[PDB]
Amino acid sequence: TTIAGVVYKDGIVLGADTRATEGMVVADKNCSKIHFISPNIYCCGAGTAADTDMTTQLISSNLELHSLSTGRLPRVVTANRMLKQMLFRYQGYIGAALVLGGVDVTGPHLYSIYPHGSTDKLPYVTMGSGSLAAMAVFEDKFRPDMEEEEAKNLVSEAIAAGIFNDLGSGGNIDLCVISKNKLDFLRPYTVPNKKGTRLGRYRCEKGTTAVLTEKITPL
Amino acid sequence: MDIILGIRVQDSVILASSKAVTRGISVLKDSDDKTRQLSPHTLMSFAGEAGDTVQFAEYIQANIQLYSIREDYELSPQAVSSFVRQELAKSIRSRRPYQVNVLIGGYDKKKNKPELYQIDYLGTKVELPYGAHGYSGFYTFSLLDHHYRPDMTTEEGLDLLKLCVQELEKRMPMDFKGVIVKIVDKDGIRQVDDF
């Protein structure tokens, strides 16, 4: 998995690959790793996939109830706290490694959240097995206060680094651009690999399989 | 406890269960009946860890007997087996699980059919024409694969069972001191006193 985020001039750009693996096998080549928290806050997910999914859904659900009661958009710090305090309580056993990005009344904010409950507040972050490949791209080319299409290219370039160089990472590149004026959920942003074309048709002809008995029931 | 077999024939279920009770170096008893009557037409044999086996069997017996009194009705073998499986499936995630494997041989008076259920300590239930627990199956299943027919009589079932016990007496290292055999049919449960 290669997930990343940057803070640019107008807001936040999140990025993620799409490969879900089970050991060495690829179960899904186009899975979604960028999760919805609130309308102005999204969360990229790495680590244990179920933990990542369910931790984001729970905090998203609780923030929705919080936001209905207060009548105002939720903040990234409250998303950060709720994730943080839960993950800390479970002492690392919930293996959720998140890149949390969103835009508040107080401006754009980006966090990295770790399974044990630590969080860093940063202008750029990377996580997952492809974090080093992605972080190399950010150390090479990041600068503060980038324009939108530039930041999009840098994150895309950082996810790509992970896709190609990390075996755990692969498939397409998803982006999520968050600013005060819009939210752009780009899935897929890029398709860096074409699906391999097969030269033969190996599908069997009808009646090839040996059947013992049959039953038909209508609905 | 060691060897427990079961075979479902045309009109009955036959359970064979070893007599030996061995703790360590010494055979403490050579006449142990590893079975409980749960209801008039349902018999359960059992094998596993010492203490747990009887405690579990007697606990199941008590619950089925309670059901029988409350409803003035005998539960089907299918229902009794599903109850037992759930108890074992509950057990396996306990603080201390019941280490007990069972065979439930019953005659369903509604369907007029014998039925044999094999359930392990995890709660792994299967309905079978013939079953065994532990190492017994390794020897016996190949015999039963060869010789079994669904339309066999009770006497043919007993002959096929003798052949199973002879093979176990030949090739197994432990002296299990023979087997107590019990037949479950439309008329209830009875013990074959000469085997």
């Binding site: 009661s69 207060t70 105002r72 903040r75 710090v77 409250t78 950060n80 706290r81 | -």
Partner: protein
């Protein structure tokens, strides 16, 4: 007639214990007032020290709940302090759980939901207090929210509470009918306090010394109460024009 002793419905669909708690509200015989400026929210309240043996510095019905939120109470001091301690605790817990300062209205609603519970559950009595919360909220700006023993709450442009609340309310109503705006169009809080005091003097028909008033001021990022000498300076400015 046990429907009047606990919080259950009377045949008219009424909760008499809630109504009697509202009457306990005026037992102190103190009037409070709250108004909003451009950058601020001002709350003023009468201060009465009848006993010469009392330490007048400890006689207060204004509370600093958080740094941003102030709360004035109309009602007896034991219930006031009950409510003050709980609001402080709630505001602190909120900041810990959600990572930002509790808004004025969110606290007001929270305290109101607690007050509602005492009107439905029989073992708990209502508190005999009306709680007026004030702040300069970072999203909604100058804010006045009020809670009562019924568990009712609402936001205000300005408000008044106490025995002579109707006189103060109508005085304020008439000013905002002229200006046609939801606030006091004034830059400095000092002048918004001067307005608040002036309009209480007019409404109640009584002059005030420095020791007859108690003032609380909310600005962006802090709520504070004025000292006797800060109020005296305020009274001097009123008299001089």
């Amino acid at each position: 007639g046990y429907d009047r002793h606990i919080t259950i419905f009377s045949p008219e669909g009424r909760l008499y214990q809630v109504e009697y708690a509202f009457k306990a509200t005026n037992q102190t015989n103190i009037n409070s007032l709250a108004v909003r400026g451009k950058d601020c929210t001002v709350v003023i309240s009468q201060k009465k020290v009848p006993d010469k043996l009392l330490d007048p510095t400890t006689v207060s019905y204004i509370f600093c709940i958080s740094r941003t939120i102030g709360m004035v109470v109309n009602g007896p001091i034991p219930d006031a302090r009950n409510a003050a301690l709980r609001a402080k605790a709630e505001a602190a817990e909120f900041r810990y759980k959600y990572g930002y300062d509790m808004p004025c209205d969110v606290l007001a609603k929270r305290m109101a939901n607690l007050s509602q519970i005492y009107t439905q559950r029989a073992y708990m009595r209502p508190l005999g207090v009306i709680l007026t919360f004030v702040s300069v909220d970072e999203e909604l700006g100058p804010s006045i929210y009020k809670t009562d023993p019924a568990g009712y709450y609402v936001g205000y442009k300005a408000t008044a509470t106490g025995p002579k609340q109707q006189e103060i309310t109508t005085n304020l109503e008439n000013h905002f009918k002229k200006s046609k705006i939801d606030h006091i169009n004034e830059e400095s809080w000092e002048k918004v306090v001067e307005f608040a005091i002036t309009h209480m003097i007019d409404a109640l028909g009584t002059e005030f010394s420095k020791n007859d008033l108690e003032v609380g001021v909310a600005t962006k990022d802090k709520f504070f109460t004025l000292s006797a000498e800060n109020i005296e300076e305020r009274l001097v400015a009123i008299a001089e024009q």
